[PDB]
RNA sequence: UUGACCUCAAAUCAGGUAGGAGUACCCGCUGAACUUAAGCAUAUCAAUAAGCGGAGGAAAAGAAACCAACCGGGAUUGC
RNA sequence: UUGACAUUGUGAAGAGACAUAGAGGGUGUAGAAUAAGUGGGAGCUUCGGCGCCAGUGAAAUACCACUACCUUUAUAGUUUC
RNA sequence: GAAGACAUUGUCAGGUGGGGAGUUUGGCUGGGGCGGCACAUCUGUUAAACGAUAACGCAGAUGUCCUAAGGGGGGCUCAUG
């Protein structure tokens, strides 16, 4: 069992694991059928660009809030500011998310601008007549790329005023740590007659 | 501790054991082989010191049985009132917590105290309960 | 402790206010603690008995007799305490009326280690019936020191009645001393008592010729 | 009440962790077994829902709503003709009614990680060994 | 044989334990004198 | 409630200009309407009291709100529901005393 | 009838000894031997008094 | 007396529907032990095998009584 | 097998236990007397009387409180049998 | 007709329960069993004059005791004849 100087292994193979073994032999064939499905879908929706327009949106956690990415759909407030109803936007190819909110003006303005450029770039056909054929592109995401915002300029002047940025962090942590005991002492000082 | 373990074969006659959480004193020990190949079993017959009941247990010989600590202590009577003896220790300590005996020992002790002998009382402690077992008279130091 | 020191301080304050100023008495008034214990049986439960020595004496002048040998009587001449010898006890010759008179004469008795054996044989069991039994003293110890000790003794013994009483001290002592002595006596009582602070029926502080005051 | 384990004379023939007979509980609800018996009684109908009406010490009383998928008023009326699709045969037997999904544990959230897409489906998904062509 | 009855077995034909059986005994144990208040031949 | 600009502390986080979006109607689900208030008052008049509510009425009358809240916490699930139930029963006592 | 463990006995008499007469009652308690126990308990009370009398 | 209503029946009444098979995959119920622990009882094997009920070309799940604690994300499923 | 809760509704009596409001009560003999016990107490006094020394009695007597055990009334009482 | 809000039934809780289930039932060892402990230790010897060194080798011992029977200092000298 235990033997020479080796690391302790944890290999979870004490069930009937050979009954559930999935070997992906069909990677290449599955990729080929996936491309076939994309091509037949594009031929079925032959003018339309195979994917909806997605908003730019800020990634959730503190690990990833430095980055911006694509969302599910646009806010109703965003599409009302763009100047078209949610039902009409869904019919002309704009993803609408009824359950996200706008708390950030920069993200709101970016999504409104993105909707303005989409409405400038598309051609909407009449529902009855001529259908003036227009040589589809296949990726609204590639025609409207998601761009990371420029946060600063690359050269500035040094503005130093003596706080060292370590004392500031330490004092902020200390006042958060000793917040509630200070209002407890303040409350008992106030109710001390 | 109040009680300490022991082995059944280490036990012998006129020794104290714990049987069914009672302090007991052995009167009989008998060992018989279980099977020809097997170890012998010890059959123990003992008497409770306080109540006088007969309790028996059989066990493997290698098994460990619980054994109490029994202390016998010597005192002089002061008074017998309301069924509670009052005793007097060497160095002058006094206890009244002992209840008087209820049997023929208690009757003989009551008559002896009524007719006025100086009575020497032996009381035993085992597992937190206290009783008086015997009384004599002081032949000297009257 | 259910009883609090500030409540003890308060109750001691009106107690000494009544005893000293409003109705002064010519005899010196002893402060009494009268206790009653609850959910307890004298017949089945263990009969607790214990004693503590207070730092400042409750009764300085209470009568004490020293049964003693030659050395004990010679020391008792220096102590100034009443004594009868073994020859005197033999004189008495186990006569019930005179020994009852002695038992009602002296509240406390101090006896030597040698003679404490035959104190029951010369005197009989009526001392144990009264509850005044002689306390042992040795040649090494100081008799007057143990007289001060016995005069400062506080004893709790169960007996048969479920209510006890002791004398904490005098009215004339200082307030902090009275508070400390009553607190240590209540603590000693609950230390002797099993299942402490819940088998306490009632605690009453009183002064001699004074009304009762109830501490829980 | 409980479900007594149907073993002769209480003998389970195993380890002492499986010797329980009396205090064992059925994993489905009395409402579920009620509507399942009603569906077996009327197999030509489809069970929609059920509700409690009454109880006593011995019985619990339910009323079961059923819809006839052959009647023309349900063949038409597009609000209800989804019940005529053959994937809805014996929803109460597959646990697809309201109390069936309640007993299967089908709910969103961190409290339902074992049972969210199907307990056995998730168990197979996280007990599968996945090997690719170019081994990672 | 002891597989067949509580009284079975042994190198002599004998009962072993007492033959008076409690009323609270279970099936397979009630073999003998069930809940006997007294036994023996009275005179 | 503005952020401070630094990574730790009381109001840590980046300062961005806020928007204060329009309130969702689902945030007012538990709000009481006039029509349901009228219905609840009428059915309370019609049905009266349950036995545990009657013995709670006796507990506010006799043994006080502390014992009433203890019994209502045993009877209902939580202390919050017990406090609300004792409060509304005290309202029923006041209204019946006015009656 | 207000001491502990008496109503448990009183249930059984209502259960199984409701229809009974005193001849049968005396016969059954004599055949079960409880009457000797009652006699010896009262006898033990008698020597409890008697030993005090002999002491006096 | 007559005509309703409610509830419960009967018809070889008019028209329909269910059962059984298959069961690799799917949705549930029920449910072990061998084995491992160098013994063994919790544990493990395993929420598995066997048993039972019920579907489809997929099924199931699915448009938050969600995740989060951030400058917040946004049905389900799968990698 | 025993207990609790539910099934479980409708009525009358009789006991018991607590809460807190208050009342009265205690006779072997001896001893001036009716000694429930404890603990303090040598002075308290309202009478200048009662205790204390002293009598008897296991237990002693004024003047104080406490604790049991009894009986005893009542509550928009709480309850159990 | 009888019985009656008691039985019964449901869920918990205590007792009883080889009727039944599952499992266990040390090691060393001049075979195993009984006996013993050579199973954790200590002194002398075997032990062959560094150290190490076996046997169910020999002669014994341990599971405690002590607020001094620990620490420091001073004075004195013991068994025996
Ligand atoms: Mg069932
Ligand atoms: Mg036999």
From Swiss-Prot, chain A:
Q: Any idea where this protein resides?
A: Cytoplasm
Q: Which GO terms describe its molecular function?
A: RNA binding; structural constituent of ribosome
Q: Which Gene3D superfamilies is this protein grouped with?
A: 1.20.5.110
Tell me which PROSITE patterns the record gives. RIBOSOMAL_L13E
- What are the entry keywords? Cytoplasm, Phosphoprotein, Ribonucleoprotein, Ribosomal protein
Q: Which residues carry this modification: Phosphothreonine?
A: 143, 151
GO biological process, alphabetically ordered: cytoplasmic translation
UniProt miscellaneous comment:
Present with 133000 molecules/cell in log phase SD medium.
This protein's assembly is summarised as: Component of the large ribosomal subunit (LSU). Mature yeast ribosomes consist of a small (40S) and a large (60S) subunit. The 40S small subunit contains 1 molecule of ribosomal RNA (18S rRNA) and 33 different proteins (encoded by 57 genes). The large 60S subunit contains 3 rRNA molecules (25S, 5.8S and 5S rRNA) and 46 different proteins (encoded by 81 genes).
Name used for this protein in its record = Large ribosomal subunit protein eL13A
Which species does this protein come from?
Saccharomyces cerevisiae (strain ATCC 204508 / S288c)
The gene it comes from is: RPL13A
Curated annotation (Swiss-Prot), chain C:
Task: Write down the SUPFAM superfamilies for this protein, in alphabetical order.
Answer: Ribosomal protein L1
Residues carrying N6-methyllysine:
46
Q: Where's it found, cell-wise?
A: Cytoplasm
Q: Which PROSITE patterns match?
A: RIBOSOMAL_L1
Post-translational modification (record) = N-terminally acetylated by acetyltransferase NatA.
Q: What is its main location?
A: cytoplasm
One cellular-component annotation, GO: cytosolic large ribosomal subunit
Q: What are the entry keywords?
A: Acetylation, Cytoplasm, Methylation, Phosphoprotein, Ribonucleoprotein, Ribosomal protein
Q: Which residues carry this modification: N-acetylserine?
A: 1
Question: Disulfide pairs?
Answer: none
Q: Which GO terms describe its biological process?
A: cytoplasmic translation; ribosomal large subunit export from nucleus
The reply on keyword Repeat is no
Q: What else is known?
A: Present with 116000 molecules/cell in log phase SD medium.
Instruction: State the family named in the UniProt similarity comment for this chain.
Output: Belongs to the universal ribosomal protein uL1 family.
PANTHER family in the cross-refs: RIBOSOMAL PROTEIN L7AE FAMILY MEMBER
Instruction: Give the protein's biological function.
Output: Component of the ribosome, a large ribonucleoprotein complex responsible for the synthesis of proteins in the cell. The small ribosomal subunit (SSU) binds messenger RNAs (mRNAs) and translates the encoded message by selecting cognate aminoacyl-transfer RNA (tRNA) molecules. The large subunit (LSU) contains the ribosomal catalytic site termed the peptidyl transferase center (PTC), which catalyzes the formation of peptide bonds, thereby polymerizing the amino acids delivered by tRNAs into a polypeptide chain.
Give the protein's recorded name: Large ribosomal subunit protein uL1A
Species of provenance? Saccharomyces cerevisiae (strain ATCC 204508 / S288c)
Swiss-Prot record, chain F:
Q: Which GO terms describe its molecular function?
A: RNA binding; structural constituent of ribosome
Q: What is its main location?
A: cytoplasm
**Keyword terms:** Acetylation, Cytoplasm, Ribonucleoprotein, Ribosomal protein
N-acetylthreonine modified-residue sites? 1
Where does this one sit in the cell? Answer: Cytoplasm
Name a GO CC annotation attached to this entry.
cytosol
Q: Name the PROSITE patterns for this protein.
A: RIBOSOMAL_L36E
Task: Report the domain of life of the source organism.
Answer: Eukaryota
**BP GO terms, sorted:** cytoplasmic translation
Q: Which Pfam families match?
A: Ribosomal_L36e
PTMs per UniProt:
N-terminally acetylated by acetyltransferase NatA.
Family stated for the protein in its record: Belongs to the eukaryotic ribosomal protein eL36 family.
How does it associate, per the subunit comment? Answer: Component of the large ribosomal subunit (LSU). Mature yeast ribosomes consist of a small (40S) and a large (60S) subunit. The 40S small subunit contains 1 molecule of ribosomal RNA (18S rRNA) and 33 different proteins (encoded by 57 genes). The large 60S subunit contains 3 rRNA molecules (25S, 5.8S and 5S rRNA) and 46 different proteins (encoded by 81 genes).
Name the PANTHER family for this protein: 60S RIBOSOMAL PROTEIN L36 (PTHR10114)
Q: What does this protein do?
A: Component of the ribosome, a large ribonucleoprotein complex responsible for the synthesis of proteins in the cell. The small ribosomal subunit (SSU) binds messenger RNAs (mRNAs) and translates the encoded message by selecting cognate aminoacyl-transfer RNA (tRNA) molecules. The large subunit (LSU) contains the ribosomal catalytic site termed the peptidyl transferase center (PTC), which catalyzes the formation of peptide bonds, thereby polymerizing the amino acids delivered by tRNAs into a polypeptide chain.
Name of the protein this chain belongs to: Large ribosomal subunit protein eL36A
Swiss-Prot record, chain G:
Q: Could you name the domain of life of the organism this protein comes from? A: Eukaryota
Per the record, where are the segments of Basic and acidic residues compositional bias? 43-56
Which Cys-Cys disulphide bridges does the record give? none
Which residue stretches belong to region Disordered? Answer: 43-56
Coiled-coil segments, which residues? Answer: 1-56
Where does the record place it? Cytoplasm
How does it associate, per the subunit comment? Answer: Component of the ribosome quality control complex (RQC), composed of the E3 ubiquitin ligase RKR1/LTN1, RQC1 and RQC2, as well as CDC48 and its ubiquitin-binding cofactors associated with the 60S ribosomal subunit. RQC2 binds to the 40S-binding surface of tRNAs.
Please give the family membership noted in the entry.
Answer: Belongs to the NEMF family.
**Its biological function?**
Key component of the ribosome quality control complex (RQC), a ribosome-associated complex that mediates the extraction of incompletely synthesized nascent chains from stalled ribosomes as well as their ubiquitin-mediated proteasomal degradation. Thereby, frees 60S subunit ribosomes from the stalled translation complex and prevents the accumulation of nascent polypeptide chains that are potentially toxic for the cell.
> Other remarks?
Present with 7700 molecules/cell in log phase SD medium.
- Can you name this protein? Ribosome quality control complex subunit 2
Q: Which organism is it from?
A: Saccharomyces cerevisiae (strain ATCC 204508 / S288c) (Baker's yeast)
Complete-protein stretch covered = 835 to 890 of 1038
């Amino acid at each position: 069992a235990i033997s020479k100087n080796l690391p302790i292994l944890k290999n979870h193979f004490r069930k009937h694991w050979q009954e559930r073994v999935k070997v992906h032999f069909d990677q290449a064939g599955k990729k080929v059928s996936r491309r076939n499905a994309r091509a037949t879908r594009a031929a079925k929706i032959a003018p339309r660009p195979l994917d909806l327009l997605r908003p730019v949106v800020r990634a959730p956690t503190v690990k990833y809030n430095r980055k911006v990415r694509a969302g599910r759909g646009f806010t109703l407030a965003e599409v009302k500011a763009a100047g078209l109803t949610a039902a009409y936007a869904r019919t002309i190819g704009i993803a609408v998310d009824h359950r996200r909110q706008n708390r950030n003006q920069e993200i709101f303005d970016a999504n409104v601008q993105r909707l303005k450029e989409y409405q400038s770039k598309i051609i909407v056909f009449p529902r009855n007549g001529k259908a003036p054929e227009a040589e589809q592109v296949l990726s609204a995401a590639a025609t409207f790329p998601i761009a990371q915002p420029a946060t600063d300029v690359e050269a500035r002047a040094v503005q130093d005023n003596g706080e060292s940025a370590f004392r500031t962090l330490r004092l902020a942590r200390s006042e958060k740590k000793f917040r509630g005991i200070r209002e407890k002492r303040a409350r008992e000082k106030a109710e001390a007659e | 501790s109040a009680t300490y373990p022991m082995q059944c074969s280490a036990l012998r006659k006129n020794g104290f054991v714990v049987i069914k959480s009672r302090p007991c004193k052995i009167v009989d020990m008998s060992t018989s082989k279980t099977g020809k190949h097997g170890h012998a079993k010890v059959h123990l017959v003992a008497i409770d010191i306080f109540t006088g009941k007969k309790l028996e247990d059989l066990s493997p010989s290698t098994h460990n049985m619980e054994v109490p600590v029994v202390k016998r202590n010597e005192y002089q009577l002061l008074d017998i009132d309301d069924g509670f003896l009052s005793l007097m220790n060497m160095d002058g300590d006094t206890k009244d917590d002992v209840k008087a005996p209820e049997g023929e020992l208690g009757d003989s002790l009551q008559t002896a105290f009524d007719e006025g002998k100086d009575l020497m009382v032996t009381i035993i402690s085992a597992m937190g309960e206290e009783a008086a077992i015997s009384f004599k008279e002081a032949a000297r130091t009257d | 402790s259910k009883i609090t020191s500030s409540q003890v301080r308060e109750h001691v304050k009106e107690l000494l206010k009544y005893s000293n100023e409003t109705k002064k008495r010519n005899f010196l008034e002893t402060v009494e603690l009268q206790v009653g214990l609850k959910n307890y049986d004298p017949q089945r439960d263990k009969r607790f008995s214990g004693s503590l020595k207070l730092p400042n004496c409750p009764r300085p002048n209470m009568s004490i007799c020293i049964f003693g040998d030659a050395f004990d009587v010679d020391r008792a001449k220096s102590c100034g305490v009443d004594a009868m010898s073994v020859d005197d006890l033999k004189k008495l010759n186990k006569n019930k009326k005179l020994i009852k008179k002695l038992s009602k004469k002296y509240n406390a008795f101090i006896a030597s280690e040698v003679l404490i054996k035959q104190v029951p044989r010369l005197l009989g069991p009526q001392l144990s019936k009264a509850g005044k039994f002689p306390t042992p003293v040795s040649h090494n110890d100081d008799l007057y020191g143990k007289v001060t000790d016995v005069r400062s003794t506080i004893k709790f013994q169960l007996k048969k009645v479920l209510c006890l009483a002791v004398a904490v001290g005098n009215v004339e002592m200082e307030e902090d001393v009275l508070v400390n002595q009553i607190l240590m006596s209540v603590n000693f009582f609950v230390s002797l008592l099993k299942k402490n602070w819940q088998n306490v029926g009632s605690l009453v502080v009183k002064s001699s010729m004074g009304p009762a005051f109830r501490l829980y | 009440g409980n479900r007594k384990r149907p073993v002769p004379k209480g003998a389970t023939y195993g380890k002492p962790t499986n010797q329980g007979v009396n205090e064992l509980k059925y994993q489905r609800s009395l409402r579920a077994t009620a509507e399942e018996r009603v569906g077996r009684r009327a197999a030509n109908l489809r069970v929609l829902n059920s509700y409690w009406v009454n109880q006593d010490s011995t019985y619990k009383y339910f009323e079961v709503i059923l819809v006839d998928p052959q009647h023309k008023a349900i063949r038409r009326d597009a609000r209800y003709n989804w019940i005529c699709d053959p994937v809805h045969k014996h929803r109460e037997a597959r646990g697809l009614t309201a109390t069936g999904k309640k007993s299967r544990g089908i709910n969103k959230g961190h409290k339902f990680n074992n049972t969210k897409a199907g307990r056995r489906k998730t168990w197979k998904r996280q007990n599968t060994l996945s090997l690719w062509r170019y081994r990672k | 044989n002891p597989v067949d009855h509580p009284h079975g077995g042994g190198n002599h034909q004998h009962i072993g334990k007492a033959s008076t059986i409690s009323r609270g005994a279970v099936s397979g144990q009630k073999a003998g004198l069930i809940a006997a208040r007294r036994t023996g031949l009275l005179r | 409630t503005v952020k401070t600009g630094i990574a730790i502390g009381l109001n840590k986080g980046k300062k961005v200009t806020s928007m204060t979006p329009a309130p969702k109607i689902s945030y007012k689900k538990g709000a009481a309407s006039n029509r349901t208030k009228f219905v609840r008052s009428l059915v309370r008049e019609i049905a009266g009291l349950s036995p545990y509510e009657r013995r709670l009425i006796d507990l506010i009358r006799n043994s006080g709100e502390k014992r009433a809240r203890k019994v209502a916490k045993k009877r209902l699930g939580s202390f919050t529901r017990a406090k609300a139930k004792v409060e509304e029963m005290n309202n029923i006592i006041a209204a019946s005393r006015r009656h | 009838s207000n001491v502990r463990g008496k109503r448990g006995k009183l249930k059984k008499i209502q259960k199984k000894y409701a229809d009974q007469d005193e001849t049968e009652r005396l016969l059954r308690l004599e055949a079960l031997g409880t009457l000797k126990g009652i006699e010896k308990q009262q006898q033990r009370k008698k020597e409890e008094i008697m030993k005090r009398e002999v002491r006096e």
